[PDB]
Design an enzyme around this catalytic site. Structure first.
Site, PDB file in Angstrom:
ATOM      1  N   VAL D   4       2.980  16.596  12.734  1.00  0.00           N
ATOM      2  CA  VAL D   4       2.375  15.599  13.257  1.00  0.00           C
ATOM      3  C   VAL D   4       0.930  15.736  13.567  1.00  0.00           C
ATOM      4  CG1 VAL D   4       2.432  14.029  14.973  1.00  0.00           C
ATOM      5  CG2 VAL D   4       4.622  14.974  14.675  1.00  0.00           C
ATOM      6  N   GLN D  36     -18.672  12.992   5.867  1.00  0.00           N
ATOM      7  CA  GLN D  36     -18.374  11.294   5.142  1.00  0.00           C
ATOM      8  C   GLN D  36     -19.674  10.915   4.806  1.00  0.00           C
ATOM      9  OE1 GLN D  36     -15.458  10.700   4.682  1.00  0.00           O
ATOM     10  NE2 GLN D  36     -15.488   8.595   4.044  1.00  0.00           N
ATOM     11  N   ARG D  51     -15.200  14.567   5.335  1.00  0.00           N
ATOM     12  CA  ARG D  51     -14.243  14.107   4.388  1.00  0.00           C
ATOM     13  C   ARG D  51     -12.800  14.244   4.534  1.00  0.00           C
ATOM     14  NH1 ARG D  51     -15.467  10.052   0.918  1.00  0.00           N
ATOM     15  NH2 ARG D  51     -17.768   9.683   1.325  1.00  0.00           N
ATOM     16  N   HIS D 120     -17.602  12.210  -8.399  1.00  0.00           N
ATOM     17  CA  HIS D 120     -16.925  12.957  -7.619  1.00  0.00           C
ATOM     18  C   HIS D 120     -15.277  12.536  -8.074  1.00  0.00           C
ATOM     19  CE1 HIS D 120     -16.712   8.943  -5.800  1.00  0.00           C
ATOM     20  NE2 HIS D 120     -15.771   9.009  -5.201  1.00  0.00           N
ATOM     21  N   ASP D 192      -8.279   3.542   0.751  1.00  0.00           N
ATOM     22  CA  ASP D 192      -9.311   4.261   0.946  1.00  0.00           C
ATOM     23  C   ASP D 192     -10.374   3.392   1.459  1.00  0.00           C
ATOM     24  OD1 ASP D 192     -11.178   6.822  -0.232  1.00  0.00           O
ATOM     25  OD2 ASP D 192     -12.260   5.142  -0.444  1.00  0.00           O
ATOM     26  N   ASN D 239      -9.180 -13.405   4.734  1.00  0.00           N
ATOM     27  CA  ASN D 239      -9.463 -11.859   5.206  1.00  0.00           C
ATOM     28  C   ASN D 239      -9.878 -11.063   4.105  1.00  0.00           C
ATOM     29  OD1 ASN D 239      -8.355 -12.621   7.895  1.00  0.00           O
ATOM     30  ND2 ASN D 239      -6.200 -12.417   7.435  1.00  0.00           N
TER      31      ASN D 239
HETATM   32  N1  LIG Z   1      -0.951  15.735  24.864  1.00  0.00           N
HETATM   33  C1  LIG Z   1      -1.355  15.203  23.552  1.00  0.00           C
HETATM   34  N2  LIG Z   1      -1.685  13.883  23.400  1.00  0.00           N
HETATM   35  C2  LIG Z   1      -2.213  13.372  22.562  1.00  0.00           C
HETATM   36  N3  LIG Z   1      -2.189  14.392  21.186  1.00  0.00           N
HETATM   37  C3  LIG Z   1      -1.737  15.659  21.079  1.00  0.00           C
HETATM   38  C4  LIG Z   1      -1.544  16.208  22.367  1.00  0.00           C
HETATM   39  N4  LIG Z   1      -1.138  17.385  22.044  1.00  0.00           N
HETATM   40  C5  LIG Z   1      -1.352  17.706  21.105  1.00  0.00           C
HETATM   41  N5  LIG Z   1      -1.745  16.447  20.361  1.00  0.00           N
HETATM   42  C6  LIG Z   1      -2.127  16.485  18.931  1.00  0.00           C
HETATM   43  C7  LIG Z   1      -3.185  17.770  18.475  1.00  0.00           C
HETATM   44  C8  LIG Z   1      -2.728  17.706  17.049  1.00  0.00           C
HETATM   45  O1  LIG Z   1      -3.634  17.047  16.153  1.00  0.00           O
HETATM   46  C9  LIG Z   1      -1.421  17.482  17.273  1.00  0.00           C
HETATM   47  C10 LIG Z   1      -0.144  18.365  16.907  1.00  0.00           C
HETATM   48  O2  LIG Z   1       0.346  18.448  18.277  1.00  0.00           O
HETATM   49  P1  LIG Z   1       1.025  19.472  18.639  1.00  0.00           P
HETATM   50  O3  LIG Z   1       2.297  19.074  19.301  1.00  0.00           O
HETATM   51  O4  LIG Z   1      -0.161  20.513  19.539  1.00  0.00           O
HETATM   52  O5  LIG Z   1       1.713  20.517  17.373  1.00  0.00           O
HETATM   53  P2  LIG Z   1       1.752  22.052  17.574  1.00  0.00           P
HETATM   54  O6  LIG Z   1       2.009  22.596  16.073  1.00  0.00           O
HETATM   55  O7  LIG Z   1       0.869  22.741  18.399  1.00  0.00           O
HETATM   56  O8  LIG Z   1       3.376  22.264  18.281  1.00  0.00           O
HETATM   57  P3  LIG Z   1       4.617  22.797  17.615  1.00  0.00           P
HETATM   58  O9  LIG Z   1       4.221  23.422  16.441  1.00  0.00           O
HETATM   59  O10 LIG Z   1       4.907  23.528  18.879  1.00  0.00           O
HETATM   60  O11 LIG Z   1       5.484  21.964  17.166  1.00  0.00           O
HETATM   61  O12 LIG Z   1      -0.982  16.528  18.290  1.00  0.00           O
HETATM   62  N1  LIG Z   2      -6.604 -13.711  10.128  1.00  0.00           N
HETATM   63  C1  LIG Z   2      -5.743 -13.282  11.015  1.00  0.00           C
HETATM   64  N2  LIG Z   2      -6.053 -12.184  11.770  1.00  0.00           N
HETATM   65  C2  LIG Z   2      -5.385 -11.596  12.695  1.00  0.00           C
HETATM   66  N3  LIG Z   2      -4.325 -12.420  13.283  1.00  0.00           N
HETATM   67  C3  LIG Z   2      -3.929 -13.559  12.912  1.00  0.00           C
HETATM   68  C4  LIG Z   2      -4.757 -14.109  11.625  1.00  0.00           C
HETATM   69  N4  LIG Z   2      -4.343 -15.369  11.507  1.00  0.00           N
HETATM   70  C5  LIG Z   2      -3.211 -15.467  12.408  1.00  0.00           C
HETATM   71  N5  LIG Z   2      -3.062 -14.542  13.303  1.00  0.00           N
HETATM   72  C6  LIG Z   2      -2.150 -14.582  14.480  1.00  0.00           C
HETATM   73  C7  LIG Z   2      -1.968 -15.548  15.041  1.00  0.00           C
HETATM   74  C8  LIG Z   2      -0.180 -15.329  15.020  1.00  0.00           C
HETATM   75  O1  LIG Z   2       0.071 -14.767  16.541  1.00  0.00           O
HETATM   76  C9  LIG Z   2       0.100 -14.644  14.245  1.00  0.00           C
HETATM   77  C10 LIG Z   2       0.892 -15.401  13.021  1.00  0.00           C
HETATM   78  O2  LIG Z   2       0.020 -16.397  12.618  1.00  0.00           O
HETATM   79  P1  LIG Z   2       0.034 -16.807  10.968  1.00  0.00           P
HETATM   80  O3  LIG Z   2       0.103 -15.816  10.327  1.00  0.00           O
HETATM   81  O4  LIG Z   2      -0.896 -17.732  10.766  1.00  0.00           O
HETATM   82  O5  LIG Z   2       1.750 -17.637  10.649  1.00  0.00           O
HETATM   83  P2  LIG Z   2       1.778 -19.158  10.505  1.00  0.00           P
HETATM   84  O6  LIG Z   2       3.150 -19.326  11.037  1.00  0.00           O
HETATM   85  O7  LIG Z   2       0.656 -19.852  11.015  1.00  0.00           O
HETATM   86  O8  LIG Z   2       1.749 -19.012   8.862  1.00  0.00           O
HETATM   87  P3  LIG Z   2       3.024 -19.412   8.087  1.00  0.00           P
HETATM   88  O9  LIG Z   2       4.076 -20.087   9.066  1.00  0.00           O
HETATM   89  O10 LIG Z   2       2.780 -19.968   6.912  1.00  0.00           O
HETATM   90  O11 LIG Z   2       3.704 -17.998   7.626  1.00  0.00           O
HETATM   91  O12 LIG Z   2      -0.773 -13.976  13.862  1.00  0.00           O
END
Ligand SMILES: Nc1ncnc2c1ncn2[C@H]1C[C@H](O)[C@@H](COP(=O)(O)OP(=O)(O)OP(=O)(O)O)O1
Ligand SMILES: Nc1ncnc2c1ncn2[C@H]1C[C@H](O)[C@@H](COP(=O)(O)OP(=O)(O)OP(=O)(O)O)O1
Ligand SMILES: Nc1ncnc2c1ncn2[C@H]1C[C@H](O)[C@@H](COP(=O)(O)OP(=O)(O)OP(=O)(O)O)O1
Ligand SMILES: Nc1ncnc2c1ncn2[C@H]1C[C@H](O)[C@@H](COP(=O)(O)OP(=O)(O)OP(=O)(O)O)O1
Ligand SMILES: [Mg+2]
Ligand SMILES: [Mg+2]
Lengths: 480, 480, 480, 480
Positions: D4, D36, D51, D120, D192, D239
């Site tokens: 993770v 990047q 990157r 690239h 991407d 969108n």
């Molecule tokens: N408390 C935290 N809250 C949010 N992210 C965290 C936390 N601790 C660690 N991370 C992140 C850092 C790393 O990108 C990623 C890996 O987590 P971590 O559990 O520290 O792996 P690890 O390899 O050190 O555990 P293990 O190897 O013991 O399974 O999670």
């Molecule tokens: N462009 C958007 N971006 C982010 N959220 C949106 C966008 N349009 C609608 N939402 C939100 C509002 C609603 O809580 C949820 C669903 O709306 P929407 O996708 O339009 O379903 P709808 O029921 O109006 O269309 P349909 O019934 O035709 O599938 O997403």
């Protein structure tokens, strides 16, 4: 005239031309090549950020707070001069950091130049001196109404404390509060923390539990013991306790991540094995080592995270040992974490004992079947001091508060006046053990030594003790 | 078929048609008119959110976690049936909340129907029953493969616990872990909290220190005492402590804000003075009061935040007293906070004593000059129980963990195995005192009674004691 | 003295006591009970926010910008008086909104009082007048250095424009720029937008593409045609175009969501059927209707979203029809969207023509097999005007810019000087058609009428035309 | 087994052991040392990201989308094998980037090896080949059920397109949709972009207007012309248009920032002056230049941002010229931006003409008083092609949509079916002119040449034309 910089944490920051001039020097720009979190990048890939951006942030917040105090209280007679001096100190307190930040002054220098006493704060001052002189900043300071003799002193004191009673020379007791802004020696509550909390959380993908803007809005200056100090509104006392809880939580999860620390350790190791052979050109063409570059600021200017790659990419067989360590990092064959424990009750461990701990762990004699026998050099033992910034002391005991009904009257608040859910202690030690031998059987063995050693020393039971050493844990009654 | 809802906290949530059907009923939609934080909106204007959206959030997270377990461990044989039942419980645990949420079951009902025992959880169950029956949901449940007899039981148990040894009927010991998801009676670690932490922080403008997604990724089911329970990865134990620290902090800053609470109190007072005159039509045209609507779900369906405006906009002079209180809220002439203190050492205060506290404060006899003399009815005294969800108990002692080297083997972790910087106690009481008489002199007086009362009862010294009652604080040695 | 309010969008906002006093009135607090987005809450459950918090935001941003201009240019001689007047206008421009915001003046009043001409801006002014008078604010204004005669005029003009060449009385041409802040009649670039962009995005769970803080940092005042106007730095012209793109995108996805609009329509319908029977007590006990409450501010004060629930919870059979509509909303049996189309080329449709469109759709004669035949009353047709705020006009043509090399010299920038990737038109119409008959066969039929009608009128091909009416679309060559 | 990683953009990402193995190689870890955004860091200090993290993000989103399609449509028979192949392509499409990312293939290689054609993408493939072979990944692929012969082909095709009718060998027409995920050659809509939008905005401090999660939830596969392609729900067409608007806006504000570009240009210049002297050890000890390292992957592996510092810190006087340029960057003495203009109507400028433009600007003969006369070598002219990813073509015309009423039936949507507020053109050119002579008088002159040149060539009037060249702009009627 003035520039605007877009920062993801604070938005658009305005920079006074003088500050721009300070920024646009090699000494300052050097901070672009130094990771805020060092080896943490190799665990938290979000954490690409460098000390540069953090320094802008500190500068800006220093400015915010001093301006806010002036707006709230004109009677303080805070001048534009004072404002810029505080900002400059803010910008410049990270100038002294070395490659991978705390890895450098926290691990490398201690081991490579044990006799010298060195901190990035010392270095910030020297680098600052060098920056001013090398770039003719003094004339520009005068042009904007600053007095270099007094002000440069003031700025250095803000960063490092007194250069030797009111011990400060740069400003009098009536402007005592200005010293509490950038680097608060009394209780650690300063704008540096505020920026790194926010900036580090944004990058690590963790969330920050402290509102610094709020704190600024409620900050006032009051008289305390014939000093004028920054005081916080009484009811904000909970927020302050939370500020240090947050700091501790960031260290637990990120700054002291077990793997992050082992990477820092492997990098340090490599630096030690390259220290004899890497040369860095200082003043007058004279040459220094990684470990001596701290003596000449012109050399230190060129000492950055780049070193790591210089070594990694080298073909010189002098550097084979150093280079080989860095390659193990790339392939992710790291030293392996064995476990974590703490001392019990009063037991405290000093720096002088650190070198002897791998030896103790190897000396443990667990009553278990062992394929391999492990040696002191196979063990790494990291000791970590976790506190609220003041060893055993509670920093809130060193904070002054003001009530709404008497805003000019400073007061003190004790822990019991806040909550029973607060910690009873404010300092502790963690011990991590790692093994340099990575295979299944070496690792299996290492666990037995470790757990046995914990039992021998009457340390706390490692969390996974029963799973990794089921044959060892039963001997200790207390453990279960 | 399935619907998508856009939520600011969780993004796009997918809803199974059955859940949609449940949602699109009057009983559920009712939650759109009930503020999550009640009176907190009047302190934190960001906090406009209602229980409705919180309920979707809970539903979704319930679904996330149960799905994640099924993906990680097929051997658990989690069925779609199980998934939907958990989601339904998730959606429906807030069904029983009344106007201004915790105001209703925490303040109003206790005072208006003291003999009855009632909780929003009780109500959620009754409202759920009513929702199912009133809308012919049972056929639809069968259509999607649910078994109403077993499943409705299961759902209710998830919300309220056993309806009366394995005490659950809705599912067997092998699916014990499903009960730990929506409303965890064992340790309080459930998805309800996770949603409110995130949602409340987003709205209040505070920041959340707990990563629930992370927790879901590291959750496994293991055998513990012939039950299959949800277990957390050992090293995540710190995050759990922090979860409850965050909870406590949210209560300190927001859910128990002194002014937020007083507004809740004034609204409660107005409800009391209107309770006799407001009529709400229940089943068969039968009529109820605000305080009796809890007996008929058809009437409770119509009982929402609207009541507040019904009263505010009324012209009936029966309601003049209730209406006048709400107007004082609008003009911001609120009861005034006097101060806060806590009991000392062991002292604990029970609910039966609450009514007698205003009387004790009025009985204090401070040695100070008083213009006005104050009466018990002029004082409000709020007693607030702050804990980690289990009174004096540490909920982490009731959590099971699994290590990486033995993922199916559950273990326990003690406080000392984590940190010495943790709290030594997990419960406490805060006492706030407010005065109904707002003028300078009544307020000045009220402070003297309050501080005197603290001294009399050997409570902790209010933070601003020396400023508000400089003549009272010296008598107590311990205070200075 | 001054208060701090924590807002999730802007953080801690400081409020001057005068503004507090204005806020803590029934006329202002009323805005707590009016959803910013009206029916959008029923689609976007994050959108629980009310006009109240938006109004604080606008107030604060008005303050930010006017302060920034004063700091940058003292020569403008902006007084604290000017600052407070702008803030007050900021706080108060939403005072006139009615239940469900734009539903009220956009749909309900037009239909219920067709002869009257009314806008929420008109109402903001009247409500403001009423607020001042009803609460003795004038004395408090004088106490803080304001001149009610001039300033109240100024404030009203900021909101509504001239109350009848320099057409403004409240301030002279040299302070012309103050009119551009709260409600910019010249080009629509004002702080109102900036708040709602940020606040709506935060709540809807969409992301805002416009940086208002940046814009404030680059704003200067310059002379243009003997007026002093706010000018934007030239290179920020792209950001301005993006500001309106963002606005349009918010309308597309949210403010004009097809279902959000239909709910607004059903609510409007219910209000119409209740208008005869709901009575609201105005000045001197005199009674008004929903549709007449706009004539007496004391009555309008009590007209909020509450009306919706008053109706939903009523038992009076007078209100059965209105109540029944609201219940269909709760069960989610909504009028069904049939589709969307646009006029072709030049074709433009007026508001009076709106009533005849359902009739046209019913008059279409599609060559298809029909079980049911549909009537004009079965169709709803919503016509939506999407623009950049100025009908056919490009608002950036009405914006003044300054260059870095001559900061006091205002200039104009044409579209071709920015990009060819900009729109060629800045206004358009969308036509949505809904059917009130919800069953499969009515809906199937409705699609045929609709698509046929599009073909008849030479409107654009609905996106799903081929799928919903495969037998109709082939007749039109252009469509395929 | 699986790891993770905590990413600030996506949260906790799960990584399959195979992917971990690929990641933990020198070829992949190399990406940690490549910004990047290249020179954008020197303008946007938030943009410290490399990157590496972006690549994890792309990998994870590739995985999200393929999984989502499999869940929604089992009939597609997407295998774990397919999933991992798509993820590997995701992780690996950035493998080929060189120092400062697009600076390397966009500026440096074109100038330094004009005869060679290089991207690239080409390099990503080669580096991938090298990574597999150098690390014995093939065995591990087989261990997890992959077939190297077919799958390595597939992966490369995903990145670069066909390696030479169905032109793909790695997978058949029935799995055509898998090619549309990581690098969509048909319309550019791929994961991407989604990662860089979100990651770049988070770091730059700009806000992202595109919801990729939403798009994934509405994505289906449908038959189109005997291919199975990914289709988007019809109503999401807006969108998509907004997606590209957002892309264009990011380029305008950040990726093509005038100063960011000039820094890229100064870095390129320094690389050119160092190219002769920097040596990089490739396969078998053989040595390459910066410009030839692209021929041996073992050398290219060591070619990163480090080069910049190698040069900056060098003492070799061979490198004095290169080093001196980098130092001007550090002191912030940069080439000066003169202005920006565009071609008019049909005029389009090809690559072959680029070298001759500084010469044209110098050949302009403005009728103005000139202290200095400027030469072609004193001008830099940057020509920037802004489009929607497909030169003149509208990519939405190359997108397939599915309606809710017939989800398996693909359809097309034209621009006129969406909006008249969309752009009429989808490609344009910007011309920026900079001067290498920084003083007041050179700069003043440069503006006259530039503006004169614009007039001569009938280009658009620079925004600040009237201010910088008031004597030149009147000659052109069209300008005024
Ligand atoms: N408390 C935290 N809250 C949010 N992210 C965290 C936390 N601790 C660690 N991370 C992140 C850092 C790393 O990108 C990623 C890996 O987590 P971590 O559990 O520290 O792996 P690890 O390899 O050190 O555990 P293990 O190897 O013991 O399974 O999670
Ligand atoms: N462009 C958007 N971006 C982010 N959220 C949106 C966008 N349009 C609608 N939402 C939100 C509002 C609603 O809580 C949820 C669903 O709306 P929407 O996708 O339009 O379903 P709808 O029921 O109006 O269309 P349909 O019934 O035709 O599938 O997403
Ligand atoms: N449109 C934008 N939105 C957000 N941030 C931006 C935008 N454009 C630039 N920035 C950032 C990048 C920099 O850190 C900072 C200053 O950029 P910019 O305002 O273009 O300065 P500049 O020096 O290039 O302009 P000039 O010198 O012409 O005033 O703001
Ligand atoms: N710890 C906190 N963090 C963030 N916001 C907070 C916190 N506590 C309160 N707020 C918010 C809620 C309010 O909108 C705003 C003002 O609250 P507060 O500062 O407690 O004023 P108050 O009127 O209760 O205290 P006083 O009148 O005693 O100064 O700050
Ligand atoms: Mg729908
Ligand atoms: Mg690990």
């Amino acid at each position: 005239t003035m520039k605007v910089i877009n920062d993801p944490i604070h938005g658009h920051i305005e920079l006074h031309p003088l500050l721009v001039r300070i920024i646009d020097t090699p000494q300052f720009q050097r901070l672009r090549y130094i990771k805020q979190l060092g080896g943490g990048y190799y665990v938290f890939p979000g954490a690409s950020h460098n000390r540069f951006e953090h320094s802008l942030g500190v500068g800006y917040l220093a400015g915010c707070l001093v301006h806010a105090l002036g707006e709230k209280q004109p009677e303080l007679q805070i001048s534009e001069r004072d404002v810029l001096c505080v900002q400059i100190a803010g910008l410049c307190r990270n100038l002294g950091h070395g490659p991978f930040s705390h890895m450098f002054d926290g691990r490398f220098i201690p081991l490579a130049r044990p006799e010298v006493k060195w901190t990035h704060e010392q270095g910030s001052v020297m680098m600052f001196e060098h920056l001013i002189n090398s770039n003719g900043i003094k004339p520009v300071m005068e042009q904007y109404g600053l007095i270099p003799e007094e002000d440069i002193c003031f700025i250095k004191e803000q960063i490092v404390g007194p250069l030797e009673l009111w011990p400060y020379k740069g400003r009098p007791e009536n402007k005592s509060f200005l010293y509490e802004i950038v680097s608060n020696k009394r209780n650690g509550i300063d704008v540096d923390k505020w920026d790194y909390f926010a900036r580090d959380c944004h990058h690590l993908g963790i969330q920050n539990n402290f509102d610094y803007k709020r704190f600024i809005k409620f900050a006032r200056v009051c008289e305390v013991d014939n000093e004028l100090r920054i005081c916080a509104r009484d009811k904000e006392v909970g927020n302050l306790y939370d500020m240090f809880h947050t700091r501790n939580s960031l260290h637990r999860r990120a700054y002291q991540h077990k793997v992050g620390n082992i990477i820092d350790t492997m990098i340090t190791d490599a630096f030690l094995k390259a220290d004899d052979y890497i040369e860095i050109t200082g003043a007058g063409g004279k040459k220094y080592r990684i470990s001596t570059a701290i003596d000449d600021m012109e050399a230190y200017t060129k000492l950055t995270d780049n070193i790591f790659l210089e070594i990694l990419y080298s073909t010189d067989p002098k550097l084979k040992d150093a280079r080989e360590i860095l390659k193990q990092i790339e392939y992710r064959n790291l030293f392996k974490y064995v476990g974590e424990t703490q001392p019990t009750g009063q037991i405290k461990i000093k720096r002088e004992d650190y070198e002897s701990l791998p030896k103790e762990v190897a000396s443990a004699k667990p009553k278990v079947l062992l394929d391999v026998k492990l040696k002191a050099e196979d063990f790494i033992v990291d000791v970590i001091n976790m506190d609220y910034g003041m060893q055993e002391k509670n920093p809130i005991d060193h904070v002054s508060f003001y009530c709404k009904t008497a805003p000019n009257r400073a007061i003190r608040i004790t822990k019991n006046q806040v909550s029973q859910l607060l910690p009873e202690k404010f300092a502790e030690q963690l011990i991590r053990v790692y093994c340099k031998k990575v295979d299944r059987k070496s690792l299996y063995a290492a666990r037995q030594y470790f757990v046995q050693w914990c039992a021998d020393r009457n340390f706390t039971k490692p969390q996974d003790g029963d799973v990794i050493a089921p044959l060892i844990t039963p001997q200790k009654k207390e453990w279960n």
